[PDB]
């Protein structure tokens, strides 16, 4: 009388699903003998072997550093100047960026058209960019053709010629570039956050500067800026790939001679008008935008602060989450799990920025207008949890992730050269991989708690928000969420 | 937002209604202190309820024992004079605060649409306060107590056809004796809870239609959460009120009353000056001014 | 995490005992 | 605790001795597992190892039943298996600190994983598990299908990929015509058991290559043989067929500009190494740009199209010239994005350029030299980034059964000449025009009107 | 012209001007006080604690015994 | 111990009584698992096929209707009833195992019960 | 007040039933179907009282 499971399509479906479940119930050890999802430390000392980065200091004060690997076939040669938009004078804000744009063009013999023709004829690339307090002009080239690239860099950095018609054309181009940046909302958010956090300080002003100032260059400001800030002690030449240190040193010595001898040293320049964090907020409500993008930030650590590594670990254990992330609801960080499980945000990203004598540390969320209060609760909860109740497995996972991220990012010739120059400018030396790993391994739960108490516990925050933000909690909400009354 | 795992306790269902209506209720950003007066009236009601309960732990509703029982509370009970002075002067401050509440409403025309229901429930609340304070003032059973009860109950005879019947039924026995005393004690104990219910309905209707502001304009542009912004303002109001009420309790406790209520009720003689408490005086003046008691 | 948790619980217990003594000052119990 | 302020070396470290400054150039070892599988590796100096598993499967092997399995499989790459759950897999990857990626193309598709050189057994074991033993659960497949439907709903934002797919579908018939982005009907039809059957039928040993970038060959083979040697030996069913004859695809969308693209056949394919190299050099000569970039010299601003069109014709949003080469076939052509009113003139200009390269004498020796040097530079600067090295190993072994040494590509690019360029352009222009248009297409010329040229 | 609320969006400045009619701004370099405030709040908080203890004890001891009873204890 | 009706007369009688009751109301033993009860049953039902879950809802509605009407299933369908033909225990066990693993190593609960 | 909180919690999760099973498939409004049932209960209680 009772029907068999063959009939009753629901009985058939139940049988099929039960068969599949009983299929996947028995694991296998030969595919599980190495997994160990619980994180643990390891000593990669047997692996961290890289060629020595030879450093030389020409007596005019010029540092040249190379990491040669003569088995390769390409190379990257560049100049890393310790100057940027921070070192302006409140009326020449856009000078650094505009000088970049101009210095691409022409010299007493380069003739921008035929200069770019030469660059593209040898097959290489030539790029540049300016940060708040760092400037880079680098070129990627091949073996036996490095010297031409080095000569071109020296020529453009020393004997550049600025002509009025090209200056007008670049004024037009930079006004267009300013008009296209507001589409990129993340950069706008971070510019506003910098302005409202380091207000009344040289770090507050943007990189591009104001259009009213870009319209009044006249090339006298350009020449004055280059002669006052591109001095010999503040520059570093870096090379990787198939290069020879002695050849590079000889070429730099023979070429970089018409420099700007001066005394404006960035250390003394930062001694005056330092960077001062001021807790505040700016919130630009629109309600015509589909997504609300905001960022909260605490005061960070300087480049040389020994707690910078701890802050890097902490921003690794608040790792970024994305709506197309592979992990999804399963991730190491508690903040990513909270965001993904309850789907309260389109994407979150924790950032750690380091400057001289200051820095930043935040979470950069981007969500929908209705989940903002829950998202803010999640962010503040996880940060103050880092203050109070950090866990050993989380710390170990964060340290492993940080080591892996750094060593995987250093990949190629241009990344190696960029690492050499940036580290030489920030610390005065290039930190070896073994020492970097030792410093990271010196971070444990007690270290994380101490650093978070130093930087997060009951400290002012700076908020920058844009879009439909009616539901975003006010300043007092975040300010009170920076501590727990339970402990 | 799908609430898979719980973020905050305040958004949990146990504290969700409380969260909304106490912490997260949007409020006009430009409110002055008279909204604090409304909250202060609520606090005065709670104070009255608590002190009244602890007083009723010692009061005997009999005609032969009420006055001496109150003197018991003043002299023998440990810190009983504080309880009695708090109850009496708290009735006075309750009426002061409610009057300031009402007059702010009149000044800013808060009775206008869409808060007609709020104003009407307020009028009902005021009626309940009047009745409660009157029947409570009958309780100590002094000269003013007994004679005010007599007069105010006997003016109910003005009803055309059923006036005398209502007067006799409310009196319970041709006078204002022991039966009326017990009746009034029970009613005085009962009414404050109906007053609490009326206050809750008052607040619910207001919360439906938001809250007015000193400008009288639409105010959904700039609104802030009630906590902590208006909790601290209300706290300043509460502390100032506490100082005022402490001035009244400890240094001038019998100024807001009449000395005839310290004489035991004697229905034979009549005190020369029969007036209600100071907060019924405007109504008494209107009624006395227009002659022909009907 | 357990040492921190028990330390915090003990601190809250000390605070609770202090509040209890403040509410009910008992030299009768304090002396012995 | 005290720390040395990070501008001073940290106390006592056991930092090791550096590499010998031009140690050597590692060779690729390839071992053929007797069931028919390939395991290849090479040594790298950097502390990072990239390990990938590449399969000869994709849209070409799709069937009317599946029709979308490749895209879904890319989305369902590192999900729960019969031995580990999805949570366990993600926790393992995070624990060692590596990155997982999946790529799905028309002809072949791969799964790659990156981590430090210490974790080689973990990398290879997790990869082999996730490929060989997948458990396509209905709920996980449904989640990924929902995401894929949303992505299909957000497709028009990039007209270039849409036009590439359109050109392939229009100008091919069966195999290469099989779509890559899983239309909505196919998405609704797709299912977990369908994925299971497709994988079990296609993911077989004689079409699997495991390529490592920075891993010792002995270690890799010693950890991979106990995980792949027992796969069944199958007879490697033949590759699908596809003919080129094809015409026009036209789709109307928003009012912002029109995107027109043209393409041709060049039937050499990757097995015709000389023609593939000549096609790459021709692409690097043609190239172009988007007229909105502000990077700097070297990005091809002196290419022929860039110079002529962009420096001469304005109101043309972007102008590029591209190629796509599959085993035994090719597809080279020009992408144009311009204003709706200008579109017929834009088509005329693109045809003029494509015929200009064909006729002899119109390409200068200096331009050819620049193109050859740029191609050599692009290849060389691409073979850094060990991820690219491992991918190249895998793709080359899948295609040719070996790794063709870089010197062959360099020599071919060296020996290409103007006569070769002209002959290849003449051959490529003879094949029937393939045309696609997207946007305000109600004003672009007819396919036959455009095809009046080129013949 | 520029609607003057997108000008502020497009032009972030390091010199931000607040109202300063009800509250004078500290000069930028000065630190956040954050301590004077908590100590003022603490003084008020233990004033409140004193008040609450007073009220509670008044109520409970009122509900406690009475002087006439204690007299009749004999 | 593990006491099954084959090796225990008391267990045999217990199973017989349960079969009689469930057959009277015509609903499988797994249908008694309340999704609001555990929230693991909620997930297991979310993972099951729609045909199976719809059959469960139909059987439950039939049982509730019979309960209201104060009657039992007619003897035909009562003889056609198949209690203890489970459809949920395997999925529930899988869900609980996954939750146990996630809790055991790190991890936040994928779902939680509101208060209350 | 406690009775009102009691009823509020129950209404949060809904009432049980004799079978003890999930019962969001077959449900009816309170009035009038259970009003009359409770009326019968009240009148019987009134006779008892
Ligand atoms: C009673 C209603 C509230 C119950 C508790 C809910 C709660 O979490 O409150 C804190 C909670 C903090 O916000 P949250 O979003 O839960 O964030 C929690 C933090 O992550 C973490 O917050 P936390 O851990 O610092 O605070 C938890 C709090 C929880 O309270 C207790 O455990 C007690 O514990 C204490 O405060 C310990 C005090 C011991 C003495 O809410 C408030 O502080 C708001 C209270 C508003 C009261 C309004 C009164 C208006 C009166 C008008 C007349
Ligand atoms: C007992 C009756 C008073 C109880 C306390 C009332 C209260 O909360 O007053 C707060 C009230 C201030 O409240 P608010 O939140 O500043 O704004 C309320 C009005 O907008 C404040 O408007 P305003 O400042 O233009 O009003 C002028 C001032 C009184 O101004 C004058 O008397 C002007 C001089 C007239 C004679 C020449 O008003 C008052 O003092 C309050 C109304 C007194 C009746 O008055 C004070 O605090 C007194 C000092 C000012
Ligand atoms: C549960 C507890 C935790 C919680 O969630 O609290 C909720 C909520 C906020 O707690 P939270 O967000 O964790 O903490 C934020 C503040 O730190 C919370 O700190 P706060 O400063 O807001 O709290 C101050 C609190 C601190 O309390 C204590 O220290 C105790 O003191 C009071 O609330 C004082 C209330 C007003 C007393 C003054 C008199 C009022 C008028 C009645 C006068 C009656 C006497 C008449 C004259 C008699 C003359 C003898 O607390 C309140 O709403 C209070
Ligand atoms: C008068 C009616 C009851 C007053 C309190 C109340 O309304 O909520 C109690 C709560 C009911 O749950 P509720 O918040 O209505 O659930 C979803 C509503 N958005 O029921 C609860 O779960 C908690 C009940 C305790 C209420 C104390 C406050
Ligand atoms: C010790 C008790 C051991 C019980 C072992 C299982 C018995 C199961 C069983 O069928 O018990 C018989 C009966 C209930 O079963 P049934 O006869 O179907 O009742 C409804 C129709 N008469 O009766 C019972 O189940 C009664 C059980 C009473 C247990 C009391 C324990 C103290
Ligand atoms: C038991 C005494 C009373 C209590 C506890 C009370 C309580 C409150 C509360 C809490 C509010 C909201 C907060 C505020 O706006 O101040 C309010 C508002 C209001 N009340 Fe009362 N109230 C009382 C008596 C009255 C009376 C007698 C009236 C007038 C008949 C009245 C009329 C109003 C009005 C009009 C508002 C609207 C406030 C506004 O417009 O902003 N209330 N009351
Ligand atoms: C349920 C709460 C209340 C109880 C149990 C209560 C109880 C009492 C008792 C027993 C007395 C007589 C004690 C005495 O003579 O001092 C009294 C007096 C009084 N009550 Fe209340 N009461 C309550 C609430 C209120 C409220 C809300 C008011 C209104 C403001 C009020 C107004 C009065 C007045 C005016 C007196 C006479 C004051 C006097 O003794 O001179 N009571 N109450
Ligand atoms: C003042 C006395 C009480 C009143 C007025 C009261 C009122 C109610 C009401 C109106 C309901 C909803 C109707 C119903 O389900 O019967 C209910 C349900 C309920 N009450 Fe009470 N109750 C009281 C005492 C208790 C006590 C003492 C308990 C147990 C400690 C209790 C436990 C329950 C339970 C468990 C339900 C849920 C009924 C269900 O299964 O659907 N009640 N109560
Ligand atoms: Zn620029």
SS (H, E, C) chain A: CCCCCCCCHHHHHHHHHHHHHHHCCCCCCCCCCCCCCCCCCCCHHHCCCCCCCEEEEECCCEEEEEEECCCCCEEEEEEEECCCHHHCCCCCCCHHHHHHHHHCCCECCCCHHHHHHHHHHCCCEEEEEECCCCEEEEEEEECCCHHHHHHHHHHHHHCECCCHHHHHHHHHHHHHHHHCCCCCHHHHHHHHHHHHHCCCCCCCCCCCCCHHHHCCCCCHHHHHHHHHHCCHHHEEEEEEECCCHHHHHHHHHHHCCCCCCCCCCHHHHHHCCCCCCCCCEEEEECCCCCCEEEEEEEECCCCCCCCHHHHHHHHHCCCCEECCCCCCCCCCCHHHHHHHHHCCCCEECCEEEECCCCEEEECCEEECCCCHHHHHHHHHHHHHHHHHCCCHHHHHHHHHHHHHHHHHHCCCCHHHHHHHHHHHHHCCCCCCHHHHHHHHHCCCHHHHHHHHHHHCCCCCCEEEEEECCCCCCCHHHHHHHCCCCCC
Is the separation of the CB atoms in B45 and B241 below 8 Å?
no
CA distance A58 to G18: 93
CA distance A352 to A319: 11
Q: Give, in order, the Cα–Cα distances in Å from A63 to each of A54, A232, A429, A485.
A: 10, 9, 11, 52
Q: How far is D32 from chain A (nearest CA, A)?
A: 22
Subunit partners of chain C (3 or more CB pairs within 8 A): A, E
- Tokens 């339970």 locate to A486
CA distance A246 to A252: 10
For residue D357, give the 3-state DSSP assignment: helix
Mutation site for E-interface testing, chosen from A199, A212, A459, A483 by largest number of E Cβ within 10 Å: A199
For residue D231, give the 3-state DSSP assignment: coil
- Tokens 């007083």 locate to B55
Subunit partners of chain E (3 or more CB pairs within 8 A): A, B, C
Quote the tokens at residue A425: 């400018």
Q: Give, in order, the Cα–Cα distances in Å from B20 to each of B13, B17, B37, B203, C25.
A: 11, 5, 22, 13, 40
Quote the tokens at residue E1: 């012209």
CA distance D110 to D131: 10
- Could you tell me the sign of the dihedral formed by the alpha carbons of D3, D9, D14, D15, in that order? positive
Quote the DSSP letter at residue E27.
P
For residue D437, give the 3-state DSSP assignment: strand
How many other CB atoms sit within 10 Å of the CB of residue A159? Answer: 12
CA distance A234 to A249: 17
Asked whether B115 lines ligand 6 (CB < 6 A), one says yes
For residue D439, give the 3-state DSSP assignment: strand
Crossing angle for the helix pair A220-229 and A95-103, nearest 10 degrees? 100
CA distance D95 to A194: 34
Picking from E29, D155, A475, the residue whose alpha carbon sits closest to that of residue B229 is A475
DSSP H helices in D255-310? 273-286, 304-305
User: Does F116 sit behind a cis peptide bond, omega within 30 degrees of 0 on the bond before it?
Assistant: yes
CA distance A431 to A53: 10
- Could you tell me the sign of the dihedral formed by the alpha carbons of G14, G15, G19, G23, in that order? negative
CA distance D156 to D387: 30
Number of domains making up chain B: 1
Is the separation of the CB atoms in A30 and A384 below 8 Å?
no
CA distance D252 to A467: 32
Q: Which ligand is nearest to the CA of B12?
A: 4
CA distance A406 to C3: 34
Quote the tokens at residue B113: 């649409």
Q: Give, in order, the Cα–Cα distances in Å from E10 to each of A86, A191, A210, F36.
A: 20, 10, 10, 52
Picking from B64, B224, B195, B39, the residue whose alpha carbon sits closest to that of residue B141 is B64
Q: Is B256 exposed, middle or buried (0-12, 13-18, 19+ CB in 10 A)?
A: middle
CA distance B263 to A327: 85
Quote the DSSP letter at residue D113.
E
Element (H, E) at D335: strand D329-338
Domain boundaries, chain F: 1-116
Identify the domain containing residue B142 by its residue range. 1-294
CB contact under 8 A, F91 and A17: yes
Compute, in angstroms, the gap from residue F67 CA to the centroid of ligand 5.
Answer: 22
CA distance D236 to D218: 28
Q: How far is C19 from chain E (nearest CA, A)?
A: 10
Residues 6+ apart with CB under 8 A from A311: A300, A301, A352, A359, A361, A451, A455
Residues 6+ apart with CB under 8 A from E44: none
Instruction: Write down how long chain E is.
Output: 74
Is the separation of the CB atoms in D211 and D51 below 8 Å?
yes
User: Does A422 sit behind a cis peptide bond, omega within 30 degrees of 0 on the bond before it?
Assistant: no
> Does residue C23 belong to the interface with chain E, where contact is any CB pair within 8 Å?
yes
Is the separation of the CB atoms in B20 and B208 below 8 Å?
no
Please state whether beta strands A54-58 and A62-68 pair in parallel, antiparallel, or not at all (unpaired).
antiparallel
Is the separation of the CB atoms in D19 and A65 below 8 Å?
no
Quote the DSSP letter at residue F111.
S
Is the separation of the CB atoms in A321 and A345 below 8 Å?
yes
What's the distance, Cα to Cα, between the start and end of chain E in Å? Answer: 96
Q: Which of A67, A88, A170, A418 is catalytic?
A: A170
Supply the DSSP string of chain B, one letter for each residue. ---SS---GGGSTTSHHHIIIIII-EEETT--THHHHHHHHHHHHHHHHHHHHHHHTT---STTTHHHHHHHHHHTBTTHHHHHHHHHHHHHHHHHHHHHHHHHHHHTTTTSTT-HHHHHHHHHHHHHHHHHHHHHHHTT-BHHHHHHHHHHHHGGGGSTTTHHHHHHHHHTSSSSSHHHHHHHHHHHHHHHHHHHHHHHHHHHHHHHT----TT-S--SSSEEESTTHHHHHHHHHHHHHHHHHHHHHHT-TTTTS-GGGGSB--SSS--S-----GGGHHHHHHHHHS-S--
Asked whether G23 lines ligand 8 (CB < 6 A), one says no
CA distance D228 to D205: 8
Nearest-CB residue to D85 (from F46, F101, F106): F101
For residue F46, give the 3-state DSSP assignment: helix
Asked whether G6 lines ligand 8 (CB < 6 A), one says yes
**Nearest CA owner, ligand 7 atom 6:** B52
Annotate D125-159 with three-state secondary structure.
HHHHHHHHCECCCHHHHHHHHHHHHHHHHCCCCCH
CA distance D31 to D203: 19
- Tokens 């059957």 locate to D197
**Opening angle at CA A292, ends A290 and A294, nearest 5:** 160
Residues of A in contact with E14 (CB under 8 A): 195, 198-205
DSSP H helices in chain F? 9-25, 35-38, 40-47, 50-69, 75-79, 89-104
Q: Give, in order, the Cα–Cα distances in Å from G36 to each of B99, D89, G4, G33, G40.
A: 47, 59, 22, 6, 6
Quote the DSSP letter at residue D310.
I
Residues 6+ apart with CB under 8 A from D445: D344, D347
Supply the DSSP string of D251-263, one letter for each residue. EE--SS-EEEEEE
A52 labelled catalytic: no
Q: Check whether A101 is labelled as a binding-site residue.
A: yes
Quote the tokens at residue A471: 């539901």
User: Does D149 sit behind a cis peptide bond, omega within 30 degrees of 0 on the bond before it?
Assistant: no
Residues 6+ apart with CB under 8 A from D360: D418, D419, D422
CA distance D281 to D274: 11
Q: Check whether A133 is labelled as a binding-site residue.
A: no
> Does residue E67 belong to the interface with chain B, where contact is any CB pair within 8 Å?
yes
Is the separation of the CB atoms in D425 and D266 below 8 Å?
no
How many other CB atoms sit within 10 Å of the CB of residue A23? Answer: 10
Q: Check whether A44 is labelled as a binding-site residue.
A: no
CA distance D245 to D240: 16
What experiment produced this structure? Answer: cryo-EM
Nearest-CB residue to A412 (from D92, D97, D384): D384
Q: What are phi and psi of B172, to 5 degrees?
A: 65, 65
A250 labelled catalytic: no
How many other CB atoms sit within 10 Å of the CB of residue A480? Answer: 13
Q: What are phi and psi of A389, to 5 degrees?
A: -135, 55
Task: Tally the C-alpha atoms within 13 A of residue A248's C-alpha that lie toward its C-beta.
Answer: 31
- Tokens 């007299």 locate to E71
CB contact under 8 A, G21 and F36: no
How many other CB atoms sit within 10 Å of the CB of residue A359? Answer: 23
Picking from D194, D163, D203, D192, the residue whose alpha carbon sits closest to that of residue D180 is D163
- Tokens 């104060």 locate to F70
For residue D318, give the 3-state DSSP assignment: strand
Compute, in angstroms, the gap from residue B39 CA to the centroid of ligand 3.
Answer: 15
Compute, in angstroms, the gap from residue G15 CA to the centroid of ligand 5.
Answer: 28
Supply the DSSP string of D378-426, one letter for each residue. HHHHHS-SHHHHHHHHHHHHHHHSS---HHHHHHHHHH--HHHHHHHHH
**CA B58 centroid distance within chain:** 22
Crossing angle for the helix pair D418-430 and D273-286, nearest 10 degrees? 90
């Amino acid at each position: 009388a009772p029907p068999p499971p063959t009939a009753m399509i629901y009985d058939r479906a139940a049988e099929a699903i039960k068969s599949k479940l009983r299929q996947l119930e028995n694991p296998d050890p030969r595919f599980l003998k190495h997994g160990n999802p619980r994180p643990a430390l390891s000593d990669h000392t047997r692996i961290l072997a890289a060629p020595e980065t030879r450093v030389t200091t020409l007596p005019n004060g010029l540092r040249v550093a190379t990491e040669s690997s003569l088995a390769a076939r390409t190379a990257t040669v560049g100049v890393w100047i310790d100057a940027g938009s921070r070192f302006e004078t409140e009326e020449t804000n856009g000078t650094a960026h505009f000088l970049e744009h101009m210095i691409f063009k022409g010299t007493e013999r380069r003739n921008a058209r035929e200069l770019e023709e030469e660059i593209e004829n040898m097959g290489g690339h030539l790029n540049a960019y300016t940060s708040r307090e760092q400037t880079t002009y680098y070129a990627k080239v091949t073996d036996s053709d490095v010297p031409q690239a080095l000569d071109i860099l020296a020529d453009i950095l020393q004997n550049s010629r600025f002509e009025e018609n090209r200056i007008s054309r670049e004024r037009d181009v930079i006004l267009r570039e300013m008009e296209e940046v507001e589409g990129q909302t993340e950069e706008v958010i971070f510019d506003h956050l910098h302005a409202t956090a380091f207000q009344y300080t040289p770090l507050g002003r943007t990189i591009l500067g104001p259009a009213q100032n870009i319209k009044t260059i006249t090339k006298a400001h350009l020449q004055s800026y280059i002669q006052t800030h591109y001095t010999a002690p503040r520059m570093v030449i870096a090379a990787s790939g198939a290069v020879k240190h002695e050849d590079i040193v000889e070429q730099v010595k023979k070429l970089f001679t018409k420099l700007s001898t001066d005394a404006t040293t960035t250390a003394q320049l930062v001694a005056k008008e330092p960077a001062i964090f001021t807790g505040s907020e700016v919130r630009m409500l629109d309600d015509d935008i589909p997504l609300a993008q905001f960022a909260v930030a605490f005061e960070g650590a300087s480049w040389k602060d020994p707690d910078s590594i701890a802050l890097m670990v902490m921003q690794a254990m608040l790792g970024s989450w994305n709506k197309t992330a592979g992990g999804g609801k399963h991730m190491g960080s508690e903040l990513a799990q909270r965001v993904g499980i309850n789907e309260v945000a389109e994407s979150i990203m924790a950032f750690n920025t380091n400057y001289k004598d200051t820095g930043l540390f935040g979470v950069y969320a981007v969500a929908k207008p209705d989940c903002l209060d829950d998202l803010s609760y999640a962010i503040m909860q996880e940060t103050t949890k880092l203050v109070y109740r950090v866990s050993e497995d989380d710390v170990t996972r964060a340290c492993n992730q940080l080591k892996s991220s750094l060593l995987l990012h250093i990949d190629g010739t241009s990344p190696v050269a960029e690492d050499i120059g940036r580290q030489l400018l920030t610390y005065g030396r290039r930190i070896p991989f073994a020492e970097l790993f030792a410093r990271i391994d010196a971070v444990d739960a007690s270290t994380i708690k101490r650093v978070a108490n130093r930087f997060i516990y009951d400290k002012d925050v700076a908020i920058a928000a844009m879009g439909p933000i009616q539901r975003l909690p006010d300043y007092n909400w975040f300010r009170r969420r920076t501590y727990w009354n339970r402990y | 937002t799908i609430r898979n795992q719980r973020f905050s306790l305040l958004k949990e269902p146990i504290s969700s209604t409380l969260n909304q209506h106490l912490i997260d209720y949007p409020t006009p950003s430009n409110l002055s202190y008279w909204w604090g007066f409304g909250s202060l009236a609520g606090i005065c009601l709670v104070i009255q309820i608590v002190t009244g309960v602890f007083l009723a732990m010692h009061y005997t509703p009999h005609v032969d024992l009420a006055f001496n029982s109150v003197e018991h509370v003043m002299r023998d009970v440990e810190g009983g004079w504080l309880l009695r002075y708090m109850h009496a002067n708290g009735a006075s401050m309750f009426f002061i605060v409610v009057y300031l509440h009402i007059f702010r409403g009149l000044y800013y025309a808060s009775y206008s649409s869409p808060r007609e229901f709020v104003w009407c429930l307020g009028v009902v609340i005021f009626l309940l306060m009047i009745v409660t304070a009157f029947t409570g003032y009958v309780l100590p059973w002094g000269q003013m107590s007994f004679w005010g009860a007599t007069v105010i109950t006997s003016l109910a005879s003005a009803i055309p056809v059923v006036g005398d019947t209502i007067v006799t039924w409310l009196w319970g026995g041709f006078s204002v004796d022991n039966a009326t005393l017990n009746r009034f004690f029970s009613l005085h104990y009962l009414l404050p809870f109906l007053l609490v219910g009326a206050s809750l309905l008052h607040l619910a209707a207001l919360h439906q239609y938001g809250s007015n502001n000193p400008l009288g304009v639409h105010s959904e542009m700039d609104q802030i959460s009630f906590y902590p912004y208006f909790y601290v303002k209300d706290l300043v109001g509460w502390v100032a009120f506490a100082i005022f009420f402490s001035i009244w309790i400890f240094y001038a406790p019998n100024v807001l009353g009449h000395p005839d209520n310290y004489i035991p009720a004697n229905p034979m003689s009549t005190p020369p000056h029969i007036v209600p408490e100071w907060y019924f005086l405007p109504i008494y003046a209107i009624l006395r001014s227009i002659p022909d008691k009907s | 995490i357990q040492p921190a948790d028990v330390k915090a619980a003990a601190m809250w217990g000390v605070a609770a005992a202090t509040g209890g003594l403040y509410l009910v000052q008992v030299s009768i119990l304090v002396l012995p | 605790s005290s720390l040395p302020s990070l501008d001073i070396p940290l106390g006592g470290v056991v930092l090791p001795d550096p590499l010998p400054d031009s140690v050597e150039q590692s060779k690729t070892k390839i071992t053929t597992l007797s069931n028919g599988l390939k395991i290849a590796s090479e040594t790298s100096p950097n502390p990072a190892a990239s390990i990938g598993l590449y399969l000869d499967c994709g849209s070409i092997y799709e069937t009317p039943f599946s029709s979308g399995a490749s895209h879904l499989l890319e989305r369902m790459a590192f999900k729960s298996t019969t031995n580990r759950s999805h949570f366990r897999i993600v926790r393992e990857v995070e624990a060692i600190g590596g990155n997982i990626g999946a790529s799905a193309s028309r002809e072949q598709m791969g799964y790659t994983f990156d981590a430090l050189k210490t974790y080689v057994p973990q990398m290879v074991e997790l990869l082999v598990d996730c490929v060989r033993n997948p458990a396509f659960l209905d709920w996980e497949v449904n989640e990924e299908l929902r995401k894929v439907k949303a992505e299909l709903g957000e497709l028009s934002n990039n007209p270039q990929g849409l036009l590439l797919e359109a050109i392939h579908s229009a100008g091919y018939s069966g195999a290469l015509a099989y779509p890559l982005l899983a239309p909505e009907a196919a998405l609704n039809r797709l299912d977990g058991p369908s994925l299971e059957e497709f994988v079990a039928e296609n993911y077989t040993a004689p079409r699997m290559v495991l390529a490592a970038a920075g891993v010792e060959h002995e270690e890799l083979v010693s950890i991979a043989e106990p995980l792949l040697s027992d796969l069944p030996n199958v007879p490697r069913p033949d590759e699908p067929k596809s003919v080129y004859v094809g015409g026009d695809f036209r789709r109307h969308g928003e009012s912002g500009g029109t995107h027109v693209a043209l393409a041709f056949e060049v039937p050499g394919g990757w097995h015709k190494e000389k023609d593939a190299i000549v096609l790459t050099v021709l692409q690097m000569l043609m190239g172009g740009g988007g007229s909105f970039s502000a990077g700097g010299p070297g990005k091809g601003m002196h290419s022929r199209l860039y110079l002529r069109v962009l420096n001469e014709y304005q109101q043309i949003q972007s102008f590029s010239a591209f190629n796509s080469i599959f085993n035994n076939t090719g597809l080279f052509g020009i992408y144009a994005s311009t204003s709706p009113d200008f579109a017929p003139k834009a088509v005329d200009i693109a045809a003029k350029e494509l015929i200009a390269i064909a006729s002899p004498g119109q390409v200068t020796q200096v331009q050819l030299d620049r193109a050859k040097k740029s191609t050599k530079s692009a290849v060389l600067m691409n073979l850094e980034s060990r991820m690219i090295a491992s991918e190249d190993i895998g793709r080359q072994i899948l295609t040719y059964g070996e790794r063709k040494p870089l010197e062959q590509f360099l020599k071919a690019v060296d020996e290409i000449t103007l006569n070769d360029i002209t002959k290849i352009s003449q051959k490529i222009i003879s094949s029937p025009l393939t045309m696609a248009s997207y946007g305000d297409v109600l004003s672009v010329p007819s396919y036959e009107s455009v095809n009046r040229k080129f013949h | 012209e520029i609607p003057a609320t997108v000008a502020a969006v497009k032009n972030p400045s390091s010199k931000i001007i607040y109202d300063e009619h009800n509250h004078e701004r500290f000069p930028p370099g000065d630190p956040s006080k954050r301590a004077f405030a908590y100590f003022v709040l603490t003084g008020g908080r233990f004033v409140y604690a004193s008040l609450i203890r007073l009220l509670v004890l008044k109520f409970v001891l009122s509900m406690s015994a009475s002087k006439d009873v204690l007299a009749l204890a004999s | 111990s593990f006491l099954d009706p084959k090796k225990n007369w008391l267990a045999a009688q217990h199973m017989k009584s349960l079969v009689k009751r469930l057959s009277k109301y015509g609903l499988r033993y797994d249908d008694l698992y309340d999704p609001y009860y555990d929230l693991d049953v909620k997930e297991a039902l979310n993972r099951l096929p729609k045909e199976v879950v719809d059959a469960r809802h139909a059987r439950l509605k039939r049982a509730i209707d019979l309960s209201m009407k104060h009657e039992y299933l007619p003897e035909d369908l009562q003889a056609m009833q198949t209690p203890f033909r489970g459809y949920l225990q395997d999925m529930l066990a899988l869900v609980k195992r996954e939750r146990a693993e996630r809790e055991a190593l790190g991890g936040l609960p994928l779902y939680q019960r509101s208060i209350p």
